[PDB]
């Protein structure tokens, strides 16, 4: 399982339900603070669908606690994202995934 | 194993002119407090998040160079052991984040006001956000140098300062015993803001290159300052009588006449007649203080003897003028010594003479637990003249120098020669 | 290189130690490759060697070198203290507390940059 | 450890601007335009 340490919430009334867009402007970070991914630089917000099992599930069920406009430094266990194989060439196995996400709109 | 590569933002910091330290002879207070409010901030002007931290930092060692730095760079407050800071949810010291448990916590929005505790008696620095306390302090640190508040801010941030009632306005009550920081300013310097260790300065003529600045030293606040010759006691009454003959007429031109009560607007002076026509301690105010200024005259190695005692009674005193007659009519004749004029060895000595008597008072005054401010606190025994002599301003430095000049220029005019 | 008895090592000496404008000061000598602990703690015999996680190094001061002015230990990369009247008092160390809002303190951890011992403490 | 060494002057410094807005508010300072720069790591000693 994951935990979520929030930064700055937004509306708090809305939460991601089934059949919805989910547009995030996230970045990434390995556990030593050595980042590898940031959708903010290429100016294109990541737009993944809910429940379709196309994102890694640590990003998925961790996004369930999010609200609209909420910014939250979450984290991920090794067992929820690339456990013993890793992404080949990019991240080694058995490594946590500290993130930094915020939701734009449309749940 | 390889050279990684990334973009990163620029950053800088600024401070006001407040430098509170601690020493053995400490003329200062030792516990301070200040507030800074935030009114305008954009989180994302670029791909990297904006950086905004507020805290305290040492003098000689907190050197943020703008290009690059340590860790990953963009170094501000907390990136080393020379600073301590806070940003909304993290304590920052030594380039490692320390989280908080704060009620209603978030990073600094607009209309958010911070407040920080600073203590030097006990080593302790803590913060209070929106009136609410935070769960941590800083202790066990070294004290080799003064302390100043800072704000380390990245691009696209507008922030405001609160110092004290002359300039700022406090939006929260200070804690018990914590003075507002606007009064720690030294009187020779008007308060301002500046960057820490500049080397490029903009200007008319297409920039400016400055060298290293000169900071106030750590023990620079500490102040610092026999037998009796036989004829010196014989001149101890003759000098103090002529000084009392000049003490009367100087206060007579300003208003103070012969009055046995003590007032300024009523202008009543007890020794406005003569030296023997004064009360016993008021005459001893001229007499018994002269043993102190003579026990240090040989302690400076100044060679002086009972020389030219022939014309001490032949060359007479000044003329008792018509305006020199006071409201009681009394006007003694001060022994003016205009025939003996200024010599540079004595003129350099009389600066070192007149500084030493005032500076040894400052230890004995502050031995009772006196502390410094820029204004007067009588029940808190704080005085705006509780600094060593070269730290004073030249107007007050002029006041306690010519008062000792006539004590010497008449004595050097008596033939008692001054040697360096 | 070391022998079969002595393990390999590296020393340092002083050429201009005698006359003709010698130079003697305080000099700060560290190694070139760091060590780093894991992300979380635990909370002769070949069996224990294949499982142990602790290492060892050593220095040897020399007879004729005064051990009252030697200091050994470990240092972080963020270290820029350069002076000539160094003592163990002159060590940057800051301890930070953290606890509950009702004064119930939880932990007080200390930051540093170096971790030194006085070499004169054994003579 | 050597005491001094060389470095490069960055070609553009950020625009800081200080003023005093009345005897009520106090001193203020602001900036608007961002500036960035590339970086190295040297990961065995962690200084950019």
Residue A32: give its domain's CATH number: 3.10.50.40
Mutate to test the interface with B, among C81, C92, C99 (most CBs of B within 10 A): C92
Is C76 touching D (CB cutoff 8 A)? no
Name residues whose C-beta falls within 8 Å of residue D8's C-beta, 6 or more positions apart in sequence. Answer: B67
| Number of residues that this document lists for chain C | 123
C22-45: burial string, b at 16+ Cβ within 10 Å, e else: eeeeeeeeeeeeeeeeeeeeeeee
Distance, CA of A104 to CA of B327 (rounded, Å): 87
Q: Virtual CA dihedral for B162, B165, B167, B168, nearest 10 degrees?
A: 20
Distance, CA of B164 to CA of B174 (rounded, Å): 11
Selection from B99, A61, A56 nearest residue C98 by Cα: B99
Distance, CA of B203 to CA of A85 (rounded, Å): 59
Name residues whose C-beta falls within 8 Å of residue C108's C-beta, 6 or more positions apart in sequence. Answer: C95, C96, C97, C98
Name residues whose C-beta falls within 8 Å of residue B15's C-beta, 6 or more positions apart in sequence. Answer: B57, B148, B149, B150, B193, B194, B196
Q: Which two tokens stand for residue C55?
A: 């290492």
Q: E strands along chain C, which residues?
A: 71-75, 93-99, 105-112, 114-118
Distances (CA, A) of B346 to B309, B343, B405: 20, 5, 10
Is C123 touching B (CB cutoff 8 A)? no
Distance, CA of C17 to CA of C65 (rounded, Å): 12
Beta strands C105-112 and C93-99 are: antiparallel
Helix, strand, or coil here: B121?
Answer: coil
CA dihedral sign, ordered B401, B402, B407, B409: positive
The verdict on whether A41 is a catalytic residue reads: no
Long-range contact pairs involving A34-42 (C-beta distance under 8 Å, separation at least 24) = A34/B4, A35/B6, A36/A90, A36/A91, A38/B47, A40/B44, A40/B47, A41/B7, A41/B47
* B360 class by beta-carbon count within 10 Å (0-12 exposed, 13-18 middle, 19+ buried): middle
Number of compact structural domains in chain A = 1
Q: E strands along chain D, which residues?
A: 17-21, 26-30, 36-39
Identify the DSSP state of B141: -
| Cα angle C105-C107-C108, degrees, rounded to a multiple of 5 | 105
Q: E strands along A1-107, which residues?
A: 4-8, 21-24, 27-29, 46-49, 71-74, 98-102
Q: If residue D24 lies in a helix (H) or strand (E), which one and from where to where?
A: helix D22-25
Q: Which two tokens stand for residue B312?
A: 């001490």
Residue that is written with structure tokens 């100087």 in the block:
B250
Residue that is written with structure tokens 């008319």 in the block:
B204
Q: Virtual CA dihedral for B368, B374, B377, B383, nearest 10 degrees?
A: 40
Distance, CA of B116 to CA of B134 (rounded, Å): 10
The verdict on whether A82 is a catalytic residue reads: yes
Judging contacts by C-beta atoms under 8 Å, the chain B residues touching residue D42 are 3
Distance, CA of B216 to CA of A84 (rounded, Å): 58
Judging contacts by C-beta atoms under 8 Å, the chain D residues touching residue C30 are 1
Q: D20 with D26: CB under 8 angstroms?
A: yes
Distance, CA of A35 to CA of A29 (rounded, Å): 4
Query: What residues make up the domain containing A50?
Result: 1-107
Helix, strand, or coil here: B372?
Answer: strand
């Amino acid at each position: 399982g994951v935990e979520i340490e929030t930064i700055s919430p937004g509306d708090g009334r809305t939460f991601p339900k089934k059949g919805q867009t989910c547009v995030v402007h996230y970045t990434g970070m390995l556990q030593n603070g050595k980042k590898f991914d940031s959708s903010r630089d290429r100016n294109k917000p990541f737009k993944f669908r809910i429940g379709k099992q196309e994102v890694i599930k640590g990003f998925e069920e961790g996004a369930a606690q999010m609200s609209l406009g909420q910014r939250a430094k979450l984290t991920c266990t090794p067992d929820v994202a690339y456990g013993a194989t890793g992404h080949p060439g990019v991240i080694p196995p058995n490594a946590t995934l500290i993130f930094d996400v915020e939701l734009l709109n449309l749940e | 194993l390889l050279l990684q590569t990334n973009l990163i933002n620029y950053v800088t910091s600024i401070r006001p002119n407040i430098f509170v330290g601690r020493a053995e002879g400490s003329t200062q207070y030792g516990k301070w407090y200040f507030e800074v409010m935030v009114d305008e901030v954009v989180p994302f002007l670029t791909a990297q998040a904006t950086h905004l931290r507020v805290g305290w930092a040492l003098t000689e060692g907190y050197s943020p160079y703008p290009g690059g730095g340590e860790g990953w760079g963009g170094n501000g407050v907390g990136d080393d052991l020379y600073s301590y800071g806070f940003d909304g949810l993290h304590l920052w010291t030594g380039h490692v984040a320390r989280p908080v448990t704060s009620p209603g916590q978030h990073l600094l929005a607009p209309e958010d006001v911070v407040s920080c505790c600073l203590d030097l008696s006990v080593p302790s620095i803590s913060f209070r956000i929106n009136g609410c306390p935070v769960q941590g302090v800083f202790e066990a640190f070294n004290l080799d140098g003064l302390f100043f508040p800072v704000v380390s801010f990245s691009a696209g941030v507008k922030v405001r300062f609160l110092l004290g009632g002359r300039h700022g306005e406090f939006k929260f009550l200070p804690p018990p015993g914590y003075a507002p920081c606007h009064e720690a300013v030294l009187p020779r310097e008007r308060l301002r803001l500046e960057p820490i260790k500049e080397y490029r300065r903009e200007g008319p003529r297409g920039p400016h290159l400055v060298g290293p600045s000169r900071c106030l030293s750590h023990t620079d606040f500490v102040p610092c300052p026999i037998v009796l010759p036989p004829h010196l006691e014989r001149i101890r009454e003759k000098l103090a009588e002529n000084i009392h003959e000049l003490w009367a007429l100087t206060r007579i031109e300003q208003g103070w006449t012969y009055g046995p009560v003590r007032d300024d607007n009523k202008r009543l002076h007890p020794c406005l007649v003569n030296f023997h026509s004064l009360p016993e301690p008021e005459r001893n105010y001229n007499l018994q203080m002269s043993g102190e200024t003579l026990k240090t005259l040989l302690a400076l190695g100044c060679h002086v003897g009972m020389a030219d005692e022939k014309a001490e009674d032949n060359l007479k005193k000044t003329k008792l003028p018509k305006t020199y007659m006071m409201s009681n009519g009394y006007k003694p004749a001060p022994l003016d010594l205009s025939h003996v004029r200024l010599t540079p060895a004595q003129t350099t000595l009389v600066d070192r003479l007149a500084e030493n008597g005032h500076n040894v008072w400052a230890r004995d005054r502050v031995a009772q637990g006196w502390s410094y401010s820029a204004v007067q606190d009588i029940p808190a025994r704080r005085n705006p003249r509780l600094v060593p002599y070269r730290l004073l301003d030249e107007a007050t430095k002029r006041s306690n120098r010519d008062s000792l000049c006539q004590a010497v220029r008449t004595l050097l005019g008596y033939g008692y020669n001054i040697e360096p | 290189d070391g022998t079969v008895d002595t393990p390999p090592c590296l020393r340092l000496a002083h050429r201009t130690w005698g006359s003709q404008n010698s130079l003697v000061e305080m000099l700060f000598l560290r190694l070139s490759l760091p060590v780093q602990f894991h992300q979380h703690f635990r909370c002769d015999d070949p069996e224990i060697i294949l499982n142990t996680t602790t290492y060892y190094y050593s220095v040897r001061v020399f007879a004729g070198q005064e051990p009252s002015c030697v200091w050994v230990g470990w240092v972080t990369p963020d270290y820029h203290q350069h002076d000539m009247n160094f003592d163990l008092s002159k060590v940057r160390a800051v301890t930070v507390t953290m606890g509950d809002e009702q004064g119930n303190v939880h932990s007080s951890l200390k930051c540093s940059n170096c971790y030194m011992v006085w070499g004169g403490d054994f003579v | 450890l050597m005491p001094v060494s060389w470095s490069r002057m960055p070609n553009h410094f950020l625009q800081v601007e200080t003023r005093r807005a009345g005897e009520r508010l106090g001193w203020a300072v602001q900036c608007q335009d961002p500036l960035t720069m590339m970086a190295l790591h040297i990961p065995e000693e962690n200084r950019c």
